[PDB]
Swiss-Prot record, chain A:
Highest taxon of source: Eukaryota
Residues of the full protein shown: 553 to 698 of 938
Reported impact of residue 71 to L: Slight decrease in glutamate and glycine agonist potency; mutant channels are activated at 2-fold higher glutamate and glycine concentrations
TM region(s), chain numbering: 8-28, 57-77
Glycosylation (residues): 99
Chain segments annotated as coiled-coil in the UniProt record: none
Protein name, per record: Glutamate receptor ionotropic, NMDA 1
Region (Pore-forming): 35-54
Organism: Homo sapiens (Human)
Organism phylogeny: Eukaryota, Metazoa, Chordata, Craniata, Vertebrata
Swiss-Prot record, chain B:
Protein task: Component of N-methyl-D-aspartate (NMDA) receptors (NMDARs) that function as heterotetrameric, ligand-gated cation channels with high calcium permeability and voltage-dependent block by Mg(2+). NMDARs participate in synaptic plasticity for learning and memory formation by contributing to the slow phase of excitatory postsynaptic current, long-term synaptic potentiation, and learning.
Effect ascribed to mutating residue 233 to M: Unchanged function in ion transmembrane transport; unchanged agonist potency and unchanged channel activation by glutamate
Domain comment, as recorded: Contains an N-terminal domain, a ligand-binding domain and a transmembrane domain. Agonist binding to the extracellular ligand-binding domains triggers channel gating. A hydrophobic region that gives rise to the prediction of a transmembrane span does not cross the membrane, but is part of a discontinuously helical region that dips into the membrane and is probably part of the pore and of the selectivity filter.
Reported impact of residue 146 to G: In FESD; decreased protein abundance; decreased localization to the cell membrane; changed glutamate-gated calcium ion channel activity characterized by decreased glutamate potency
Protein name, UniProt field: Glutamate receptor ionotropic, NMDA 2A
Lineage: Eukaryota, Metazoa, Chordata, Craniata, Vertebrata
Curated annotation (Swiss-Prot), chain D:
Protein name per UniProt: Glutamate receptor ionotropic, NMDA 1
Recorded consequence of changing residue 34 to S: In NDHMSD; uncertain significance
Intramembrane segments: 5-15
Effect upon mutating residue 50 to G: Increase in glutamate and glycine agonist potency; mutant channels are activated lower glutamate and glycine concentrations
Record's disease association: Neurodevelopmental disorder with or without hyperkinetic movements and seizures, autosomal dominant: An autosomal dominant neurodevelopmental disorder characterized by severe intellectual disability and developmental delay, absent speech, muscular hypotonia, dyskinesia, and hyperkinetic movements. Cortical blindness, cerebral atrophy, and seizures are present in some patients. Neurodevelopmental disorder with or without hyperkinetic movements and seizures, autosomal recessive: An autosomal recessive neurodevelopmental disorder characterized by severe intellectual disability and psychomotor developmental delay, involuntary and stereotypic movements, spasticity, and inability to walk without support. Intractable seizures manifest in some patients.
Outcome of swapping residue 39 to L: Slight decrease in glutamate and glycine agonist potency; mutant channels are activated at 2-fold higher glutamate and glycine concentrations
Effect noted on mutating residue 35 to A: In NDHMSD; likely pathogenic
Domain of life: Eukaryota
Curated annotation (Swiss-Prot), chain E:
Its biological purpose: Component of N-methyl-D-aspartate (NMDA) receptors (NMDARs) that function as heterotetrameric, ligand-gated cation channels with high calcium permeability and voltage-dependent block by Mg(2+). NMDARs participate in synaptic plasticity for learning and memory formation by contributing to the long-term potentiation (LTP). Channel activation requires binding of the neurotransmitter L-glutamate to the GluN2 subunit, glycine or D-serine binding to the GluN1 subunit, plus membrane depolarization to eliminate channel inhibition by Mg(2+).
Name assigned to this protein: Glutamate receptor ionotropic, NMDA 1
Organism ancestry: Eukaryota, Metazoa, Chordata, Craniata, Vertebrata
Segment of the intact protein contained: 799 to 844 of 938
Transmembrane segments annotated in the record for this chain: 7-30
Disease link: Neurodevelopmental disorder with or without hyperkinetic movements and seizures, autosomal dominant: An autosomal dominant neurodevelopmental disorder characterized by severe intellectual disability and developmental delay, absent speech, muscular hypotonia, dyskinesia, and hyperkinetic movements. Cortical blindness, cerebral atrophy, and seizures are present in some patients.
Annotated source species: Homo sapiens (Human)
Length: 123, 295, 149, 191, 39, 63
């Protein structure tokens, strides 16, 4: 059907948050793995490739982040089901016809009994 | 109408008459033309269970690591438990990991029940100081009417200061209001709300929200005084209402599209949520890195 | 005034043991307008109906005191023995189409004012003509709420 | 790999704990099985959303009322104007064998009849009904306002004080004393 | 009929262009990181 | 129908890319291990780029 409908700004916020993850992982190494490790661990766990394993406080924080990542997947796949599955002329009973507009012009063939069943009735 | 009544040009006068108490002073009246008035047209416990069960399984892990002794339950096994929210006893934990995935599926169905089953509105009514002090809001509020109205007399009775605001914006047609709503030139409108009930339904797209979900403000036919017709009119009147023939006219003349208003929710999102939760997370580090091995 | 036991329009509640209304307060903490209202205790036919004056609460009391102010009247406020409007119904001999209840009480002279939110009748207006009505409603339908799964 | 290994690998991958790694032909087959496991999760979570999110009395327009059944018996209070608005119109003939044969002495008896689940619905003036629906959570006022009368005052035809009362009555609407009683007696509660 | 993809094709084009740019930077970055690992 | 052929094409592309990247670690089995990894990611610096396309495959699961 489409490309992303999901507000490109939000996708940029995703990129910003992943770099925030990288910052918070690489800072707390020296307080009790500093170049491209926790980069690829953020790409492990924030992509939920490896969801489990891969001091303790940074790990608490990161597993809260993985909880967020699961929530984000849940919300966007809920939108995948939603905006695909979620939210005419009925007859004479339309106000399209009871109040016939010139955006809704209609016609017949002349010398028809169709026009007779028109010209008999009132409204 | 009232000149034609008083000076008796129109001995009978019907109209869609907003029957004023003021007009009742001047003219006798039958029943209200239709119901009308003044309207405004405008454009917990699952969590604790989770904590309990995770502490149970962490303790069970501690015991099973104690009974491999005939790698860190403080360390590694807890981050494994975290990963399984989202080694023979570890098989039994993989069972409960599959359980946690079932709970993920359940609250995906739940968040689908949230994000389907939103509809929001902005204006309350005269209780808004949006109307009362419009210049005490940026942008100052933009509200006009077609002059010499009975509703205008009622606001002269209410707030002629509000008329000082209205005369900055007062209009002459209903299509003036249609433009100024569809072009944002005036913010919303309050009139005899029945006309708003036609034309709000008869809006294109029907984003031009009216005077609340139909909140009638200025709540609730001319007879020359002493006309003998009045009992005849009003007894006939019960029957018309006792026959619902006005309702037959309602089926004739009323509806547009807001008659089929369809729970106007969203159809991408910018809820806060995590914007709360982010404010927690950094402070967690502010807990722990003060608690260092001081001695 | 005879008052149909119509809540909140008239909450018909008993008085104190004093025979007096209390000092009860609104959500705004305001001393609620209460009215002594004379009429039956065992408010059912074939039961000993004891005309007790009882506390009364409501819209209409507020309005009557507004009209005491603007209009300078006193108001003689009673309870219905029937608890009913009272329609033209036939008495024995099976023809006597007579207004009962509140309609009877005005048309007997016994009530001289009905202060009640009265659904207007082309027919009741043929006998007893309203002032300007308050509310513009109609009959609606109480439905049981279904339980959850 | 023959005793309890591929047991726990089936519990690894069929539970999709470890989805990736864990001769070649058995691995082809097993990753087809993991594809099945993903399909099964997709179908049952589709059912989790489905059977939770997927698939009454409208008024007089029901054939429940146009063809009134004795599984749907209804009632009023006698000596009421409600019964007058019944007995005026025509096609309540099927209804008068409910609305004249089952009735009450107070509307509260019918309210209890909803609460006692005696009769299925009732037809009363909307004010008290919508109040108590906002007050108690057994009550849904369905249908429209039927016979949309006004609520007026019992004044005799020779009682001359309709007049300044009507002027007040007018000051009430014009200055929201109607709306003041809406504050002070109407607009309170919810479910 | 009763209609029983374009999202797919957009994903095909995006992922294809990204992988092509990535691979044609792989050799360059491997060469320069061999120069940096010489340091 | 047509989505299936696209899947076969793209998986063969990424398997060949894996073969080349294992050839350019030489300045563990692309026939073996890397393919079962590709299977697992339907459901090591280039492996980061595959984790990107693994996240893509998860998007296709959601779709």
């Amino acid at each position: 059907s489409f490309m992303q409908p999901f507000q490109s700004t939000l996708w940029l916020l995703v990129g910003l948050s992943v770099h925030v993850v990288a910052v918070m992982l690489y800072l707390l190494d020296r307080f009790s793995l500093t170049l491209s490790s926790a980069m690829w661990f953020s790409w492990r766990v924030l992509l939920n490739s490896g969801i489990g394993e891969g001091s303790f406080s940074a790990r608490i924080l990161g597993m809260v982040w993985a909880g967020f990542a699961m929530i984000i997947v849940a919300s966007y796949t809920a939108n995948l089901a939603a905006f695909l599955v979620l939210d005419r002329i009925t007859g004479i009973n339309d106000p399209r016809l009871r109040n016939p507009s010139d955006k809704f012009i209609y016609a017949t063939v002349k010398q028809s009994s169709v026009d007779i069943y028109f010209r008999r009735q009132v409204e | 109408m009232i000149g034609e009544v008083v000076y008796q040009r129109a001995v009978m006068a019907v109209g869609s008459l907003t029957i004023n108490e003021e007009r009742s002073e001047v003219v006798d009246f039958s029943v209200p033309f239709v119901e009308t008035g003044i309207s405004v047209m405008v454009s917990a416990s699952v969590w604790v269970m989770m904590f309990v069960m995770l502490l149970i399984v962490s303790a069970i892990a501690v015991f099973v690591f104690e009974y491999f002794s005939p790698s860190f339950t403080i360390g590694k096994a807890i981050w494994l438990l975290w990963g399984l929210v989202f080694t023979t006893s570890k098989i039994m934990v993989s069972v409960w990991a599959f359980f946690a995935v079932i709970f993920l599926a359940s609250y995906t169905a739940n968040l689908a029940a949230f994000m389907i089953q939103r509809f929001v509105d902005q204006v309350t009514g005269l209780s808004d100081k949006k109307f009362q002090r419009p210049h005490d809001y940026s942008p100052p509020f933009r509200f006009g009417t077609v002059p010499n109205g009975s509703t205008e007399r009622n606001i002269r009775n209410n707030y002629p200061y509000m008329h000082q605001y209205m005369t900055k914006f007062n209009q002459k047609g209903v299509e003036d209001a249609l433009v100024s709503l569809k072009t944002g030139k005036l913010d919303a409108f309050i009139y005899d709300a029945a006309v708003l009930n036609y034309k709000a339904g008869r809006d294109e797209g029907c984003k031009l929200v009216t005077i609340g979900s139909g909140y009638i403000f200025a709540t609730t036919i001319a007879l020359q005084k002493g006309s003998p017709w009045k009992r005849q009119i009003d007894l006939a009147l019960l029957q018309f209402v006792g026959d619902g023939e006005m309702e037959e006219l309602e089926t004739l003349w009323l509806t547009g599209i807001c008659h089929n208003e369809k729970n106007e929710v969203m159809s991408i999102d910018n809820m806060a949520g995590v914007f709360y939760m982010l404010a927690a997370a950094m402070a967690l580090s502010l807990i722990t890195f003060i608690w260092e091995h001081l001695f | 005034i005879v008052t149909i036991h119509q809540e909140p329009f008239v909450y018909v509640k008993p008085t104190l043991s004093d025979g007096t209304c209390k000092e009860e307060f609104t959500v705004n903490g305001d001393p609620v307008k209460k009215v002594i209202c004379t009429g039956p205790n065992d408010t059912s036919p074939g039961s000993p109906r004891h005309t007790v004056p009882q506390c009364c609460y409501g819209f209409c009391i507020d309005l009557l005191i507004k009209l005491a102010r603007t209009m300078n009247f006193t108001y003689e406020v009673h309870l219905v023995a029937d608890g009913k409007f009272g329609t033209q119904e036939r008495v024995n001999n099976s023809n006597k189409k007579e207004w009962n209840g509140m309609m009877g009480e005005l048309l007997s002279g016994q009530a001289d004012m009905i202060v009640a939110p009265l659904t207007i009748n082309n027919e009741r207006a043929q006998y007893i003509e309203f002032s300007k009505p308050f509310k513009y409603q109609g009959l609606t339908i109480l439905v049981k709420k279904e339980i959850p799964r | 790999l023959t005793l309890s290994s591929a047991m726990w690998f089936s519990w690894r991958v069929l539970l999709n704990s470890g989805i990736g790694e864990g001769s070649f032909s058995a691995r082809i087959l097993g990753m087809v099985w993991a594809g099945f496991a993903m399909i099964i999760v997709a179908s049952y979570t589709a059912n989790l959303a489905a059977f939770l999110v997927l698939d009454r009395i409208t008024g007089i327009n029901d054939p429940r009322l146009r063809n009134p059944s004795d599984k749907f018996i209804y009632a009023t209070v006698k000596q009421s104007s409600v019964d007058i608005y019944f007995r005026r119109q025509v096609e309540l003939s099927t209804m008068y064998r409910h609305m004249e044969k089952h009735n009450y002495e107070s509307a509260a008896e019918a309210i209890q009849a909803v609460r006692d689940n005696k009769l299925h619905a009732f037809i009363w003036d909307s004010a008290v009904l919508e109040f108590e629906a906002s007050q108690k959570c057994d009550l849904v006022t369905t249908g429209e306002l039927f016979f949309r009368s006004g609520f007026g005052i019992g004044m005799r035809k020779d009682s001359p004080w309709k007049q300044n009362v009507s002027l007040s009555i007018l000051k009430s609407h014009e200055n929201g004393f109607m709306e003041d009683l809406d504050k002070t007696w109407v607009r309170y509660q919810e479910c | 009929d009763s209609r029983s993809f374009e999202n797919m094709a957009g994903v095909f084009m995006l992922v294809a262009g990204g992988i092509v740019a990535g691979i044609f930077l792989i050799f360059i970055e491997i060469a320069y990181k061999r120069h940096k690992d010489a340091r």
